[PDB]
Amino acid sequence: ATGQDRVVALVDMDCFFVQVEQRQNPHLRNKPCAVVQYKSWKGGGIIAVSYEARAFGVTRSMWADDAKKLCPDLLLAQVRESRGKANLTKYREASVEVMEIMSRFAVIERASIDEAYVDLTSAVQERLQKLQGQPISADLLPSTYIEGLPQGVQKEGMRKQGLFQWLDSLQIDNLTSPDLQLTVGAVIVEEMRAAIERETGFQCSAGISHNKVLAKLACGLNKPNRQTLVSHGSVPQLFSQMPIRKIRSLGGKLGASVIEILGIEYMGELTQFTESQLQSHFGEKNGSWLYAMCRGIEHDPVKPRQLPKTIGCSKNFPGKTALATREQVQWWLLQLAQELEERLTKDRNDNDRVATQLVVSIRVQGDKRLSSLRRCCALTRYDAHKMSHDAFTVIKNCNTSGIQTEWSPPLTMLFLCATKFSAS
DNA sequence: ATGTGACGCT
DNA sequence: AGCGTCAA
Ligand SMILES: Nc1ccn([C@H]2C[C@H](O)[C@@H](COP(=O)(O)NP(=O)(O)OP(=O)(O)O)O2)c(=O)n1
Ligand SMILES: [Mg+2]
Ligand SMILES: [Mg+2]
């Protein structure tokens, strides 16, 4: 069993927030530029970076003042602020544009604001019947790389050489061949990406493979504005020098313990271990997942879900801005509640659903965790004053200050999240 | 002083 | 229900 039953694609917009700002402001197009939030602390935090600016070393999570040292001509678009908070509505609305287009071709799993997985298995079957044994020509794959080819001068010439080798070895006599299915999947993803660019102006990259992990890895191989086919046969060479941390979900603690417990570096080294061995170190599910994954096999389905299942709104209060008075906490809980309410009302009108749970999270000064404490409470009315009052009720117990007006220990984050949606 | 969404574990 | 991880 080779895990070649499905055709899965991962479409990811290139430097998404930048492209959103570049569409709106033509003077930013074809320039080193980045998107920044809050200009007051070190010129603001960089949150997205055009490929021209990336060539100078500018990255996400950099302060704009430091980015300017690397790239003095860097152009910056600023995130909208509302009620004292960075507001991401323009990017969420642009996300909805691209997802609705992708949804025309197949069912999609929203994986982030700027990417979706798509199960193309059925669409490939139908497209194979319309083709009626007719070969696939290179003109149908004008931006596709075949990973690991060519084998046996300039960028575009080698892409074509690899594509030509792939298409000349293709056995179209068989409508069940997985390589043919992947190839037809890639013809559809070219049309998908052309529709996105035509109808939004936004460019994106894609990976095409047999499962989600390989599709996502494939997408990043030839960014920007290109797509990549990772076939089952290409996995052994691909994985033989692929660091473990590059595989989705292995970029943190679990991947680091794989490396340390097993004494290995690359994904292909995992194949020498039995399934039971991997389960002993990493548990039954992780072990089974690793045993199949290092062979290019994974079964996680593309879930039919185009909409987020939580709706969240948070604000950081770093260092000396931390909230230390009762009245401060109440004012910022109401600012957040008002943003959440307008987001929730729009969600109900657009998507015919209502959240029923409100989760209230806070961070306390001196805690290195994301959240210091989470408490849930009922969400009955999209009313910001009631939501903020309710949110305060369930956290006022955390004020350990003897004086009534002060708040201690001081709060470095407030986080409101509406969840548990039901039809409406 | 980086600044919200999906999921597994218990 | 409350927490931790990974990321996007
Ligand atoms: N930590 C992060 C990751 C992403 N984002 C936002 C900004 C991104 O433009 C957008 C999509 O994230 P992304 O796909 O990981 N990278 P981006 O689309 O900017 O560039 P590519 O590397 O995908 O071409 O989500 C963020 O604000 N904070
Ligand atoms: Mg992207
Ligand atoms: Mg992305």
Side-chain angles (χ1 to χ4, degrees), chain A residues 103-139:
Chain A
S103 294
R104 293 212 301 264
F105 295 81
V107 275
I108 69 153
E109 176 176 353
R110 182 203 202 270
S112 93
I113 200 168
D114 95 316
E115 71 208 81
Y117 296 93
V118 29
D119 196 314
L120 290 168
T121 311
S122 293
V124 162
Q125 308 318 316
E126 295 210 48
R127 193 54 169 287
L128 271 167
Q129 295 329 343
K130 197 159 82 93
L131 280 204
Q132 269 147 308
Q134 160 192 183
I136 292 129
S137 71
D139 295 13

Side-chain angles (χ1 to χ4, degrees), chain A residues 256-280:
Chain A
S257 77
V258 175
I259 289 164
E260 187 206 40
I261 289 182
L262 291 187
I264 63 176
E265 289 169 277
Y266 308 118
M267 272 280 333
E269 299 180 69
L270 281 168
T271 53
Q272 72 210 104
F273 301 95
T274 73
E275 185 174 8
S276 294
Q277 280 172 322
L278 300 175
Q279 289 175 321
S280 78

Side-chain angles (χ1 to χ4, degrees), chain A residues 12-17 47-48 51 54 60 113-114 223:
Chain A
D12 189 284
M13 317 294 309
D14 305 325
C15 52
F16 189 41
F17 288 14
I47 71 173
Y51 278 84
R54 286 183 213 202
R60 199 182 65 235
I113 200 168
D114 95 316
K223 279 198 163 263

Side-chain angles (χ1 to χ4, degrees), chain A residues 103-238:
Chain A
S103 294
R104 293 212 301 264
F105 295 81
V107 275
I108 69 153
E109 176 176 353
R110 182 203 202 270
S112 93
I113 200 168
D114 95 316
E115 71 208 81
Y117 296 93
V118 29
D119 196 314
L120 290 168
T121 311
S122 293
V124 162
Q125 308 318 316
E126 295 210 48
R127 193 54 169 287
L128 271 167
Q129 295 329 343
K130 197 159 82 93
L131 280 204
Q132 269 147 308
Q134 160 192 183
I136 292 129
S137 71
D139 295 13
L140 297 184
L141 295 157
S143 67
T144 297
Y145 279 80
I146 312 293
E147 173 65 22
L149 296 185
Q151 58 102 3
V153 163
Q154 294 176 336
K155 269 94 180 186
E156 173 66 2
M158 307 161 174
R159 178 201 85 81
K160 275 184 172 93
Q161 249 312 306
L163 180 58
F164 285 153
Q165 287 183 0
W166 172 259
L167 286 174
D168 265 282
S169 61
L170 218 41
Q171 252 57 82
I172 42 162
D173 64 276
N174 186 10
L175 293 212
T176 50
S177 168
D179 292 347
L180 184 52
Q181 302 186 296
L182 290 195
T183 305
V184 172
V187 169
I188 297 169
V189 181
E190 291 270 17
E191 296 163 345
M192 270 188 61
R193 294 178 41 248
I196 294 173
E197 184 171 20
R198 186 192 65 105
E199 295 183 38
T200 70
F202 301 146
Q203 278 178 2
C204 60
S205 299
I208 302 110
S209 193
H210 287 298
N211 52 62
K212 288 161 66 167
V213 167
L214 285 185
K216 169 71 172 168
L217 186 63
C219 186
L221 294 178
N222 287 105
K223 279 198 163 263
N225 200 31
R226 297 289 186 263
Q227 61 188 59
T228 307
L229 193 157
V230 161
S231 62
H232 182 82
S234 76
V235 176
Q237 294 203 63
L238 180 64

